[PDB]
Amino acid sequence: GSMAKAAAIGIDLGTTYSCVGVFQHGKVEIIANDQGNRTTPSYVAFTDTERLIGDAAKNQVALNPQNTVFDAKRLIGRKFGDPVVQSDMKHWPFQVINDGDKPKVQVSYKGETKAFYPEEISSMVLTKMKEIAEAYLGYPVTNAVITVPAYFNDSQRQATKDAGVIAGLNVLRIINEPTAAAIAYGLDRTGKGERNVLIFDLGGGTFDVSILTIDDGIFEVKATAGDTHLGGEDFDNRLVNHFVEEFKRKHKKDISQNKRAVRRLRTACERAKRTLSSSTQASLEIDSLFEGIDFYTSITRARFEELCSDLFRSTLEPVEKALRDAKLDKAQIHDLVLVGGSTRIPKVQKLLQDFFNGRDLNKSINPDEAVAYGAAVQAAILIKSTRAAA
Template identity: 60%
Template sequence: MCGVRGSSVGIDLGTSYSCVGVWQNDQVEIIANEQGNRTTPSFIAFTESEILIGNTAKNQYLVDPANTVFNVKRMIGRKFNDSIVQANIKHWPFKVTSTKDNKPQINVEFRGKTKTFQPEEISALVLIKMKEIAQAYLGTEVQNAVITVPAHFNNWQRQATKDAGTIAGLNVLRILSEPTAAGMAFCHQNHNHKYTTRNVLVFDLGGGTIDVSIVSNGCGIVEVLATAGSMNLGGEDFDNCLVDYFIAEFKRKYGKDLTNCQRALRRLRTASERAKRTLSLMSEAYIEIENLYDGVDFTSIITRARFEALCEDYFRKAMELVEKVLFDSKLTKGEVDEIVLVGGSSHIPKVQQLLSNFFDGKDLNKSINPDEAVAFGATIQAALLTQNESPENLQDIVLLDTTPNSLGYQNASGVKSTIVHHNTTLLTRAIARNNQSDGLIQIFENLENSSIGTISLEKTDDNDIAFDLDLNGFLNVFTINKLTGEETKLNITFEKGRLSNNDIKNLTERLARYLTKDEAYKHPIEANSKLKSITDKKKLQGKTITIGITNFTHVIKWFKQQKENFLKLSKTIAKLLPTPPHKRPSALFLHLVLPKSSWIDHID
């Protein structure tokens, strides 16, 4: 893609963890965060002074779960009354309410005030973190990104994810399906077979979603034959099974119901996630939580067999998706050459056993890192789109992705017609005859449920309707004059809830203000704490100094009114402390609260 400026990255925007990579030195580099980890929790926490993202936010979950947001991928692009959103709300410690357009919004306490955030904003904050990780590694600004989504994401969810990228300050080059990205990663790393066609089943079981795709790779062409998935099947659901099991055990043993205690639930969830990971390596896991609820120390042992029984329904649903994608691809089991595991939950032994058994004992391919494969493929796609001359070992790669959902319309008579069938190759055009009177027609994705919007048509026998799908899976609608071939693009009036360009601009500016304000806002908070430490705890000249914190509140107020007199005020504070001049903390205080003179301007 000529003309693209700035560095480009590939980002796996995951439900539980996210990952970022860059093409450098003729290869993909997956970038570690500041803790040295190559994946970063998709967690956002809101505190009195700042927004935390990633590892620090996940740590904050133990302290303040109501203001720690995660799993936003399960609500982005959905309606508030969507069954998946409603099913997950009961597991989320943070508050989710509905907008006037029936869209979910997250409610948190931030800097002492109740704030609401759109799902796109939360995803944007995760993307900002991934961008910062890449910029720290590259030493230059990152402007462009390929962002991955579950293959079964519909038009609304893909657009919402792209909007999140825009809010994060990224030029979104492509919205790429996760199993497609993983398939690209596998095919790139196994290029020895590029002159023979091989059918690869990509089984992507992550923290919140599952995608199963069959990818055909040969002669440099990576073609998705079929895909299937579920938005409500992943590691988080396995965690929920364990949490429910331990809640029932606690009640059975002690006769106490801890479901209304958020502190107990968050500690139990953390222990359950740890136990799940242990059971992928060992036959049993032991949990011990001191003073879990009402003074009770809770201990328990769970075996791998019990865990597998608890999650049996989810495992069965996963295998049903494998059957479906095999049927849609019109391949037999024997025609699948490789089975590639992707996603953290693909580590679970039972999942691997079921997959192998389904394919009559076939060995599973574990040659790629399941936690990094999606970001790896997204990085390859970013390199292909942004290099003026593609790297030598990428020149032969051509990607042919598919749409997981059908598209069609309902005419004025109420008759629905499918125009684009699911698993149709992207960058395609489907033609329909215009045989209705003047008026509006409604466009549907998966005809039975998801309305995209409406278009206005004029009756004429000379025009046909064209549905165009671009490489992101987004729909454009045209009329085509059958006599002249002239095309006219029709405006789609989208259903309420989609962000407008003005909404995106406002949300971008709001997040920028919050994040810019973070550093300045922390200084008075830290100074408040430091002054309290100096005046309430230290003994100077053998006497305990007891200046109330109310004094500092007045100090802050006075800063707002007369910041030019700050030096005079610091001397006033110093006089309140019976300390020798050379030991007075005013210099330290000045250093702490005024590293930049602008912080006073940012106090709410």
């Protein structure tokens, strides 16, 4: 009669990490990739013999900086002249070229110089997320919901759809990331009456606050605010500068000119930063860091909190601006939702809870997974084709 339909997937196509989910048996499954990771780096690397995507691309970035592409989402749907693009190019080791006032990334790949549009790089990340899902389901996947930031314009939204089409996906809908995080908590299923929801999204490189109103399951974006120069990488930089100084005091040596030693220090700092979200202290143990000297040290959560104190407090400025723009008082916010791995930081949670007079934060869905979770919930709703009973 009618063959069973394949499940549709929800993709969070992130600037630094991407995540894929599927709603089945009344629940969302966030799908781990073949290395057991529930999030996949939005990285694509090019060599003489291969194109690597995700963890394989991110793991070889140190020795292949010119041909490993990341941050394509900062270029998608933008003009080459755009001041955002020009400033961002100074921080990237890969080449960004001008093709008819449209940016393209230029690399060495399989013996040739090749240039790609940002939507083509994003399509490679989407092909990997589709394959992660088909490895779990055991059949080909066709349908997907893809999320974007609420501030994305029409051109940025159309380029995202174009990336989906290149990847062989049927894009059911492009939905806003804060709307997807709200859907994950079922905040559109609470019945009649208006609800004001604040989404607090602290990423690897940027911070976004959104205020949404939800009335009978209808979403309206009331205000957006944030900080483009505030994210997880800034907290990693503070630990790096702290340990460089510490090595100087202890061994009278400046390591800051050996890229390998700095990179090994930063990698260790990022992991110590993650440990400090669950423990009150963390160890840093690097062998032969510089001039055959082993660096075996520690850092308390209190010292880390002091090192990043100004950065953590600055997350409250866009919160107050968003509340002024939405014309709301903090007491009028019904729900607070956390998005991004950096929101696991206990001090970040405490500052925000204190700002909203002890209110509970929705953090039960892994903050790095909430956007894909809501996108998977929406994807299952969009493919329903029920015919009314008499």
